[PDB]
Amino acid sequence: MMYVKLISSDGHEFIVKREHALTSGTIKAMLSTNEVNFREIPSHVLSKVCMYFTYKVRYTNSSTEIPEFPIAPEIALELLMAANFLDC
Amino acid sequence: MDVFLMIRRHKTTIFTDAKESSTVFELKRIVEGILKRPPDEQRLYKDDQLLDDGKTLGECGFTSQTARPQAPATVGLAFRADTFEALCIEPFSSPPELPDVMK
Amino acid sequence: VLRSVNSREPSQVIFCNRSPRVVLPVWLNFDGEPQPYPTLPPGTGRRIHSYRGHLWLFRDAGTHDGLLVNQTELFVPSLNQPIFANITLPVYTLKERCLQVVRSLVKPENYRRLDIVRSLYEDLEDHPNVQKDLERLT
Numbered sequence: 063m064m065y066v067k068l069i070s071s072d073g074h075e076f077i078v079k080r081e082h083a084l085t086s087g088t089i090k091a092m093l094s095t096n097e098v099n100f101r102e103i104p105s106h107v108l109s110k111v112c113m114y115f116t117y118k119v120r121y122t123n124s125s126t127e128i129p130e131f132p133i134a135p136e137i138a139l140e141l142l143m144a145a146n147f148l149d150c
Numbered sequence: 151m152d153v154f155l156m157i158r159r160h161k162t163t164i165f166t167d168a169k170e171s172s173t174v175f176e177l178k179r180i181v182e183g184i185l186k187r188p189p190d191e192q193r194l195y196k197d198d199q200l201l202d203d204g205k206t207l208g209e210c211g212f213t214s215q216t217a218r219p220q221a222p223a224t225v226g227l228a229f230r231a232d233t234f235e236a237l238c239i240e241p242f243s244s245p246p247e248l249p250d251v252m253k
Numbered sequence: 254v255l256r257s258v259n260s261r262e263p264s265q266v267i268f269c270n271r272s273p274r275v276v277l278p279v280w281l282n283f284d285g286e287p288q289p290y291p292t293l294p295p296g297t298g299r300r301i302h303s304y305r306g307h308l309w310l311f312r313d314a315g316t317h318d319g320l321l322v323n324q325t326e327l328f329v330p331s332l333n334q335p336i337f338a339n340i341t342l343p344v345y346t347l348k349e350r351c352l353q354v355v356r357s358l359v360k361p362e363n364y365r366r367l368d369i370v371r372s373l374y375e376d377l378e379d380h381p382n383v384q385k386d387l388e389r390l391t
C-alpha cells in the first residue's frame with residue numbers, strides 16, 4: 063500500500079509514505095509485512111531520518127532556495143551512524 | 151499551501167502532509183485510511199486544544215511556514231474505546247550526553 | 254582541462270548568495286589553478302566584472318562544502334544586462350550533512366577518539382576540498 067511502518071529500538075512506530083522510505087536502499091531491501099524493525103536506531107534518531115525523507119522529496123529539483131537541514135549536536139553521531147547504515 | 155505534520159498517539163507517529171485549506175475532518179479521513187479507525191472514533195489536538203472537524207488546518211495554526219518538511223508540526227490523536235481515552239503521546243528517547251570530544 | 258578560456262571579452266555577472274553560508278567564489282585561472290575571491294555573506298549580491306568563457310565554482314568559505322550555482326557545479330559567464338549567478342545550498346545526502354555537523358563540533362585531531370567504524374573516521378578526514386573536486390575532470 064501507500065504507507066510503511068518503521069519501528070525504532072525503543073518501540074516507537076513511524077508510519078511514512080512507502081515512496082519516502084524506498085529512498086533508502088537498505089529499507090528497500092528490508093521491505094522486499096510493510097514493517098521494518100530497527101533494533102539499533104532509537105526514536106530520537108529515527109524521527110529525524112523520517113523528517114529527512116520529507117525534506118529530500120520536497121526540495122529535490124527544486125523550487126529554488128533550499129533551507130539547511132537541521133541536526134542538533136546531541137543527535138549528530140547516532141544520526142551519522144544511521145545515515146551510514148541506511149545509505150541516506 | 152502544503153503543511154507537514156506528525157500525527158501522534160502513544161508510540162505511533164504518522165508523517166504526512168496536507169493542504170493548509172484542508173479540514174480537521176479530512177485529516178481524520180487520512181488517519182482512518184492508515185489506522186483503520188473512523189473519524190467519529192478520533193479526537194485531534196493542537197497541544198491540549200481539541201480541534202473542531204470543520205476548521206481548516208490553517209485556522210488551527212498549521213501553516214506552511216511552521217509545519218515544515220524538516221521540522222513538522224505535531225497533531226495529537228486520541229481514540230474512543232464507549233469513551234475517549236485521555237490524550238497521551240509517548241516522548242521520543244533522550245539523546246546520550248555529548249561526548250567530551252564534542253563539547 | 255578545467256580552465257578559463259582567455260577570451261578577453263567582458264561579461265558582467267551578479268553573484269547572488271541565496272544560501273545561509275558565507276560563500277567563497279573560486280575562479281579557475283588559465284592554468285586551471287583555483288584563485289579564491291572575496292567572500293559573500295549569507296543573503297548578499299555583488300555585481301562583478303568577469304569574462305566570457307571564464308570558469309567559477311562556489312564553496313562554503315569556512316568548511317569548503319560544495320554549493321550549487323544555477324543548479325550546477327560550474328558557472329561560465331556568457332554574452333550579456335548582467336548574467337545572474339544564483340548560489341544555493343544543494344540537497345546534501347543525510348550522511349554528508351551529518352559529516353558536516355560532526356566536523357563543525359570535533360577538532361580533526363579528535364576524530365579518532367569517536368566511537369564509530371574506521372570507514373567513518375576516513376569520511377570525516379576526507380573533508381571537502383576544491384582540488385579533489387576538480388580531479389576528475391570526467
Ligand SMILES: Cc1ncsc1-c1ccc(CNC(=O)[C@@H]2C[C@@H](O)CN2C(=O)c2cccc(N)c2C)cc1
Nearest residue numbers: 268278280282290291292293299301302303304307
Ligand atoms: C568584490 C567581489 N566579491 C566576491 S568576488 C568579487 C570580485 C572582485 C574583483 C573582481 C575583478 N574581476 C576579476 O578579477 C576577473 C574575474 C575573473 O574573470 C578573472 N578576472 C580578471 O580580471 C583577470 C583576467 C585575466 C587574468 C587575470 N589573472 C585576472 C584576475 C571580480 C570579482
